[PDB]
Structure formats: structure tokens, C-alpha cells
Design a protein around this ligand. Sequence first.
Ligand SMILES: Nc1nc2c(ncn2[C@@H]2O[C@@H]3COP(=O)(O)O[C@H]4[C@@H](O)[C@H](n5cnc6c(=O)[nH]c(N)nc65)O[C@@H]4COP(=O)(O)O[C@H]3[C@H]2O)c(=O)[nH]1
Ligand SMILES: Nc1nc2c(ncn2[C@@H]2O[C@H](CO[P@@](=O)(S)OP(=O)(O)OP(=O)(O)O)[C@@H](O)[C@H]2O)c(=O)[nH]1
Ligand SMILES: Nc1nc2c(ncn2[C@@H]2O[C@H](CO[P@@](=O)(S)OP(=O)(O)OP(=O)(O)O)[C@@H](O)[C@H]2O)c(=O)[nH]1
Ligand SMILES: [Mg+2]
Ligand SMILES: [Mg+2]
Ligand SMILES: [Zn+2]
Ligand SMILES: [Zn+2]
Lengths: 269, 274
Amino acid sequence: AIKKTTEIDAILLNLNKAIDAHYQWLVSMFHSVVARDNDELPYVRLMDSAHQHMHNCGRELMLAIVENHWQDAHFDAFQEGLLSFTAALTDYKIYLLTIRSNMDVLTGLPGRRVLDESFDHQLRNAEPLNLYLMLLDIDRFKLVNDTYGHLIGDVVLRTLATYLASWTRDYETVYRYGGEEFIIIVKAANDEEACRAGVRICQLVDNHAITHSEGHINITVTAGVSRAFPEEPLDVVIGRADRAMYEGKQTGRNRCMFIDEQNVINRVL
Amino acid sequence: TTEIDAILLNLNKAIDAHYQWLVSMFHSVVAFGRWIDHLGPLDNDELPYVRLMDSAHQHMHNCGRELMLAIVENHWQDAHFDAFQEGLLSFTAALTDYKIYLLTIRSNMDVLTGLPGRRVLDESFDHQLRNAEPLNLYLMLLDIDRFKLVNDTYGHLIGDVVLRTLATYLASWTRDYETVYRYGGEEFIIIVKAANDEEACRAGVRICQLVDNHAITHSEGHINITVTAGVSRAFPEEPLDVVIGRADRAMYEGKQTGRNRCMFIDEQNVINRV
Ligand SMILES: Nc1nc2c(ncn2[C@@H]2O[C@@H]3COP(=O)(O)O[C@H]4[C@@H](O)[C@H](n5cnc6c(=O)[nH]c(N)nc65)O[C@@H]4COP(=O)(O)O[C@H]3[C@H]2O)c(=O)[nH]1
Ligand SMILES: Nc1nc2c(ncn2[C@@H]2O[C@H](CO[P@@](=O)(S)OP(=O)(O)OP(=O)(O)O)[C@@H](O)[C@H]2O)c(=O)[nH]1
Ligand SMILES: Nc1nc2c(ncn2[C@@H]2O[C@H](CO[P@@](=O)(S)OP(=O)(O)OP(=O)(O)O)[C@@H](O)[C@H]2O)c(=O)[nH]1
Ligand SMILES: [Mg+2]
Ligand SMILES: [Mg+2]
Ligand SMILES: [Zn+2]
Ligand SMILES: [Zn+2]
């Protein structure tokens, strides 16, 4: 999808699980003889292809050994495919780690940098649908820090992060963009659909208090939604979404704003 | 960071190397050891992980030798393969443990700046306060002034450079024993150790000057910045959040009053500019 750091460790685990599993596999062959999204799609396709081929050599190798017409070529071919497999994983591994070295420690959401690097791609692959960026900024969060302390503030962010991650779809990623600032990349058919997604999240934030050791704390967020037109750079879009959000804060808070193609702002209902 | 990727590489190099090894044994029948000592005695944190896998590696090969000998001399048993596999998985466990440890320890280093992250400080603060004696400990919070403007003006890439640079400068301008942390997006913390509040404030105010007195170069020209800081004492047995909060209180008023200045909050919780 991805979001949430935990999701990545889960994979890397299963990658290392394959390494061990395929060691065992090789031992067995040796035993038996004696006894008589579009970003990460390429990496999986690659290793899937490698995996197949590896086993193919193993089968070919085994059959050749048994039927008494094996040749040094058969082992070298198997080893070629086996290292090709362990390459394919490694590539995938790295990619993940890199992408997810930029993962926010506090919340476990992806950081601005992840978005920066992936945005140009996400916009291109949005078609036929439209892409929208939703900026959320916690309302008077300083107060919350001033009132309860920073630890508590840290919890709110963790929680809010977790909630937002749960409330969003898989293909739509939630990013910790800033200190109190979040971005959700929404994909929809029209501006109205985007706004609905926007406005509903704001309600949910409002409608779900954040529990802590010492009790309960209610919050709300003012959001700014905007269209992402083809070939625009991220900074242009954010800026527009920021323009949207600011007016929302001017007008009362706890609300989702939207900035149209004409660069005119209107609150959503 | 770079130092770690170098290792992780060499760990994965062993996995491949030891696949080949196994293939050779299988081939021959049908017919790392050097790198470990070349790590250069590390510290007491990571010693156990290397000892562990070194031990595992040995044992693994031992089974392989025992296995091979048994196969050739015609007195091998299913036990021999299972024993070898036990040791082989024990080896791949030993690496994995080491791997994790590294990643974890090294996730908490800030990717962008290369300074330690908040989490490092969180975990080490209680310790740093205890070992401050006989000296006093102070926390210095720095927050770039109108950095949003800089992003809005030049873009985020440029903004990213400024932070990298500022980080680097601050690291150079601080003492070894006093650590600079990327606490937040535009927020830095320096843990100062001094004899009195005046000494701390001097350290504080001078850093702010340096930031002011050193423009940040980029591909397309030069960008000047400044920082408003907040310094505070750390009294024994206080938790970090209390101190930071106080240091934040100090900084905020500084921003209210004009910016590009170091503020200090006294034992009486009263703020004064340096
Ligand atoms: N004006 C001023 N600048 C300061 C002060 N403390 C640090 N700096 C600046 O920060 C740099 C880093 O100091 P270091 O990493 O402790 O590395 C230092 C430190 O280990 C040692 N050193 C320099 N001065 C002192 C000192 O007063 N006491 C001790 N114990 N060591 C010192 O020499 C190393 C190299 O120092 P530099 O090349 O000068 O580079 C210094 C200097 O440019 C200060 O109190 N006043
Ligand atoms: N504990 C904690 N505090 C943070 C963090 N990131 C940012 N903050 C603090 O949250 C505060 C947000 O300041 P704003 O005044 S801009 O936030 P508001 O919600 O009050 O702004 P708006 O009223 O919505 O315009 C700042 O003082 C930051 O130091 C964080 O990661 N952990
Ligand atoms: N390029 C880049 N920008 C960042 C980063 N971390 C935080 N920022 C931005 O820094 C900006 C600072 O906004 P503030 O208004 S809170 O900072 P100011 O300096 O304007 O606030 P003060 O006036 O100093 O209180 C925010 O818009 C953040 O998006 C970052 O890692 N890379
Ligand atoms: Mg806010
Ligand atoms: Mg600032
Ligand atoms: Zn398989
Ligand atoms: Zn070996």
C-alpha cells in the first residue's frame, strides 16, 4: 500500500524466512540424493521470475542426477539461478529499507520525504481518476502541549496517526508531513467525491477522543483539499492546499476547505 | 549511517557465499571467516552480536565437515543432515539478530541531517542528567525563524539543504560531549554541561550568532537564516518533558519579542533574554 512502518518489518521478516526456507530445500535435495502499487510491482515480478527459474534448475538438476546424464553445467546453472534469486530479494530488500528509512519514528507513518520522492509517480498513475491532496493540521495543538505536557502531545499524534491510517483506504497513503501536519493522497472521480472523503475524516477526528493514562482528550482538525493537475510539482499543490487550510482556520476551525480550479476557496458540507 | 550499509552488505554477501558453499558440497558428493576479524574491535554494545554469530559460523562448518566425512566413509545418518541444518539455521538466526539490532539502533539517526533523533535523546536523557555532576546540565532548544517562508519561497528541496547545512554547522560548532539532536522538523536540541547559568547562556547566545553569521549556500545562491533559542537548567531527577516544556516556554517569548535571540528561563520560571 504501504504506510505504517510495522508493515515493512512484516515483509522483511518474510523475505528472510524465504532465505532460511530455501537453505533447507537445498539440504533436502542433497540429503535425498545421498539416501537415494506501480512502484514496487517491478521488484516482486523480478523475484517471482527468479524464484520460478531457480526451482526449474533444481528439478532439471535432480532429474539429470538420477537418470545418469548429469553434467557440471547442471550445477553451475542451478547456482546461477540460485544467486539470481538471492539478488532479486536483495534488490527488493534495499528498496524497502530505503523507502522506509524515511519512516516517521514517532507516528510510524511515512515522512514528507517518502511523498516527495513518490509524488510525481503517483500523479502519473492516477488516471483515469483524479488525484487530490488533503492537508490536515491539528487545531490549537500547542494548547494541548501547554496543558498536558509533551509526552501527552506525543501520544495524541501517535493515536491520531493510527486513527487516520485506519480511516483511510490502502491505496490512499497518510503521511506525517509536519509536526502537527498530515497529508492524505486521495484518488477519486470528481471534486465532490474528494471533498466527502475530506469532510468525513474531519468528523471522525472530532468524533473520536484520544485516550491517555490520565484520562481523555478531544481534538479536531482543519483540513485543506485540492486537485493535483498533471505534471504539477508537489510544492505547488501543497501550497494551494495550505492556502485552503489557512482560511478554514480564519473562519472557525474543525472543518474541511477546498480550493477550486479558479483558486477560490469554499467550505465543504 | 554509511558505515552500517557497508556491513549489511557484507552480511548479505555471506548468505550468498554460504549458499554456494552448500552447492559445492552437494556437487562434490555427486562427483566471512576473514571479514569478522576485519571489523576492528568495536564497543561493548555490539560485541555480543558478533561473538554470537562468530560462534554460530564455526559450529555450522563443523557440522558440514562431520557431515561430509560421514557421507564419504559410508556411515552417515539422517541425524547428520538434521544437525547440519540445525547449525545452518542457527547461523542465519545469529545474523538476523545482528541485522535487527543495527537497523533499530540506526533507524533513530535522522536520515535528512545525520544528527541523532529525538528518540536517542529520550532514551539517554535520564542517564546524561545523572552523570552531569559535579557540573550543571542545560538543554538548549533552537527553532529556525520563519522557515515556512523559506520553503514557500525556494521550495522544499532548498529547505532540506538548509536543515542539512544547519545541522552540519551546529555539529561543528558544538563540543563533543555536548550532543546536537534533531528533535523536530525545524527544531534542534543541544545538551550543554556547564558550571553556572551564565556559562550556559554564553554557549546559547554564541550559537545563535554563528547561525546568523553564516549564510547557507545552495546551487542557486545564498540564503540567510537565524534561530530563536530557549535555554533552561535541568534539575536532578526531572523528566525530559518537563525540561523541554520549560525550554519551549523560553523560546516562544523570544519569538514574541523579535526573534534571532537566545532566551533563558530561571529557577523562578521567569524569562530573560541573554
Ligand atoms: N569561542 C569559543 N569557541 C568554542 C568554544 N567551545 C567550542 N568552540 C568551537 O567549537 C569547536 C569544537 O570543539 P570540540 O568539538 O570540543 O573540539 C575541540 C576541543 O576538543 C579542544 N578544545 C578547544 N578549546 C577547548 C577548551 O577550552 N577546553 C577543552 N577541554 N578543550 C578544548 O580542541 C578541539 C578543537 O577546537 P576548535 O578547532 O577551536 O573548534 C571548536 C571551536 O571552534 C568556546 O568555549 N569558545
Ligand atoms: N510533543 C510534540 N509536540 C510537537 C511535535 N511536533 C510539533 N509539536 C508542537 O506542536 C506545536 C504546534 O504549534 P502550532 O501553534 S503551529 O499548532 P496549533 O494547532 O496551535 O496551530 P493552529 O492553531 O492550528 O494554527 C508546536 O509548539 C510544536 O512544538 C511532536 O512531534 N511532539
Ligand atoms: N523542506 C523541509 N521543510 C520542513 C522540514 N521539517 C519541517 N519543515 C517545514 O518548516 C516549516 C516551519 O513552519 P513554522 O511556521 S512552524 O516555522 P517558522 O520558522 O515559520 O515558525 P516560527 O516563526 O519560528 O515559530 C513548516 O511549514 C514545515 O513544513 C523538513 O524536514 N524539510
Ligand atoms: Mg494547528
Ligand atoms: Mg521556527
Ligand atoms: Zn521456493
Ligand atoms: Zn564460511
